[PDB]
């Protein structure tokens, strides 16, 4: 499974979760929060998974530390054993 995020288009943390919902084929009930993301990355999403995050810095702006908190859940999922490849470009 492949997921793409165009950072320069992320204007809010809300934008980020909805983009992920689409890109990761998350359930319609997706909670759009850090706990729901972890739950999706470890008990829903397909593997192997590749997350390509373009213009990460720019998205880091219009979301505060939100982008960083979301990224940390992905890295945390990887540490848990999930086959996720993160590209920060």
């Amino acid at each position: 499974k492949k997921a793409v995020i165009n950072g320069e288009q992320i204007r809010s943390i809300s934008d980020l979760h909805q983009t992920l919902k689409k890109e990761l084929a998350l359930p319609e009930y997706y909670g759009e929060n850090l706990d729901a993301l972890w739950d999706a990355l470890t008990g829903w999403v397909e593997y192997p998974l590749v997350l390509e995050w373009r213009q990460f810095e720019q998205s880091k702006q219009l979301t505060e530390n939100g982008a960083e908190s979301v990224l940390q859940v992905f890295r945390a999922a990887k540490a848990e054993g999930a086959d996720i490849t993160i590209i920060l470009s």
Binding site: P27, Y29, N33, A76
Partner: protein, 110 residues
């Protein structure tokens, strides 16, 4: 087998026996049995089981945190197919909460 997978059934069980009912298995254990989340095949590889018992990191900080307290979660109302949006959350000192909207909001029940 007698599956217990309701909010009050599991909540009561959690408080009376300090552990989940026998119909629960962690994500890791489900995997070792052939569970592939994206296949929604949990019931096929482990009939009558539900995902439960894994550590809950309370990443949004919505549940009350405290030194020495660790949270865990377990799926509620699951029977077969893909996982739903219901979860029971319990701490080491037995505070019990629930969510039916995929962790957006929680309700204390014990």
């Amino acid at each position: 087998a007698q599956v217990i997978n309701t909010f009050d059934g599991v909540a009561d069980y959690l408080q009376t026996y300090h552990k989940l009912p026998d119909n629960y298995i962690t994500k890791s254990e489900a995997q070792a049995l052939g569970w592939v989340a994206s296949k929604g095949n949990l019931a096929d590889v482990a009939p009558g089981k539900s995902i439960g018992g894994d550590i809950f990191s309370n990443r949004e900080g919505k549940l009350p945190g405290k030194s020495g307290r660790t949270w865990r979660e377990a799926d509620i109302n699951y029977t077969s197919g893909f996982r739903n949006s219901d979860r029971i959350l319990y701490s080491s000192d037995w505070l019990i909460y629930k969510t039916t909207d995929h962790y957006q909001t929680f309700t204390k029940i014990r």
